Amino acid sequence: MFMINILSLIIPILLAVAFLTLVERKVLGYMQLRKGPNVVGPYGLLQPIADALKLFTKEPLRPATSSISMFIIAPILALSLALTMWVPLPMPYPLINMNLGVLFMLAMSSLAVYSILWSGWASNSKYALIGALRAVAQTISYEVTLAIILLSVLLMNGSYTLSTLITTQEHIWMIFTSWPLAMMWFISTLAETNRAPFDLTEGESELVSGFNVEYAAGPFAMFFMAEYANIIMMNAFTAILFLGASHDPHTPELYTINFVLKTLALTITFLWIRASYPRFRYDQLMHLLWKSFLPLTLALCMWHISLPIMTASIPPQS
Template sequence: MDRAALLADDPIWLILIKVVILLLLGPIMTTFMIIWERKVVARMQQRPGPNRVGPNGWLQSVADAIKLPFKEQIIPTTADRKVYWLAPLVSTIPAIVAFSVIPFGPEVSIFGERTVLQLVDLPVGVLVILACSSMGVYGIVLAGWSSGSPYPLLGGLRSAAQVISYEIAMGLSFVAVIVFAGSLSTGDIVDAQHSIWYALALAPSFVIYLISMVGETNRAPFDLPEAESELVGGFHTEYSSMKFALFFLAEYTNMVIVSAFATTLFLGGYMAPWPISLINDNYFNTGWWPLLWFLGKTLVLLFIYIWLRGTLPRLRYDQFMRIGWKVLVPINLVWIVVVIAVNVIVDEGLSTGQWLLGSGIVLVVLIGLSLLLPERQVPDEDQVPVTGGGYPVPPLDLQIPGKPKRKVRPGRRDRARVGAGAPDQEKETD
């Protein structure tokens, strides 16, 4: 029986169990990720991390989760209260919904009922996850606008530009996977990677997705919507208590979602990694073992998030936008053309001469387009003096004229010194 048929036969009690587990997965992973991130970054920076609450400080996130709901709620008088309350929910709910289409494992038995470790297997599962990750940004935009404060508004505007830039790059990185797998179903994509993971076969798409998912989730070095050095706290500056906790929950849940999605698309999903798969493929890819492999791959990607935050400085906004529009999107478009061309060659069985002719035509077209591009205008040194990053600054030899010096007549004490035989000299002062 295939995956869709098994899920269709799930009884109501089994569906409710899956729903409850998926609802708890976001808060549990958020609690774990916060304390894990604090400890890992503390180890990287050679400083003590949380070590007071619980054994070795592992209950610090639990203490924070208990503390936040009891903190005072401060709402600005200029805030639009309805949208102000709605924004955290708009960010949190889509992030949790996205778990429903991710396959965590193959067919298993739960209390004697055969099922699949997945809530639903939609034929457009990839688009569902992409839509859920995009919806969360609307909560950030609404939070920035409804706060009635300039810093949250700037953070919301940055987030709107950010999602447009990196959502396009992320969506384009799926195209090559869909072409190779021949399906938009997440379960079918995992099954298509039985022979080789798409992280190896489609390495450019994998790298572009890794960069895009960091920008999509507003994490360092792309955390510009909440840059504390520029915007105090960004879009959540005016939020406190439980509403602030919901934004934290949405951010870390989105991190788990995009990492689990990367595992599904590029790392073979729940299939055993290479050394283990050589031992006994039928044993380690059946039962509850695949759930362990899926969580392990997801945690590796989450560790990359922490690694980037602990080592890289925040980018400037112009650098951030330039990477999205001038690097990721063009490379992705060229890579999609290459993937489709290779796919056609394999399907049609073209000869070597036909393949070389097609490659030559594409090369000539690319060279012709490059010749048509306008040359970059480099400003003369006389027009723009020594610059910092292309911005005109005052010349280095600029001298600010000082006040003219004036002569001061000697006072009584100076005249007495002159009378006593001291040399007569005039005193100059500014």
């Protein structure tokens, strides 16, 4: 029955990604004095399905200069890793309960970056190469600060087990304890998911399509699905880490509802930011993270190391 559980996690997540596309289109339109898609289906509900069918019934083109093996492998890696990262999340009970789930998610996010770089390099197009290099710069900018913030926050948890975050935040949200780290973490999640104002890899205005400029039909659909799934998964991680939820062991549905609502709110915030702010220059993104976020993260990491000791609040290891 574990296979049933894996399918239950996978299939609904992909449908959630599909309808997230509709939600984004409508939210941005309404924030722009427009109505998002409404013609296709009641209130635009069937637009995602039409988009998926159109993309998968569209000719996929293999670039003449492309390296076919990497060109094909990259979307597979992106989608599979995007689906994999959802596994360890406690909602409330995780599909795979790992002692070090947080480090697993960090490593898997690191692995997903190669999908963008491999896609851009294999495309053998100048714009794709520029997008891949931008992705490299983005990872260089954000990875260290992301890891340090996660370590600082998890010091109060006492472990890297995602499930134990629920117990730690039983009485209060961790955002109250670590609201600055929460802000830097939210921006870093925006950077990791390559979302505005850090949508540099794709950068339609500056790079025609970035790394996916040479991708069409199914592979592009896979890249889009990976992107949106990563958005949802990272926002869910933020909800678990900071905006904890009440869990009644006899009724998990309450925790599941609270968690889903918080993640929806965070994803809506993502779309809101994409609508509101302009895009950063990748030099500016790297400067922001290294010159502004990194020193504050180091100072706050020192603070969070000291605070449990000086306040006798060291969390239980188990």
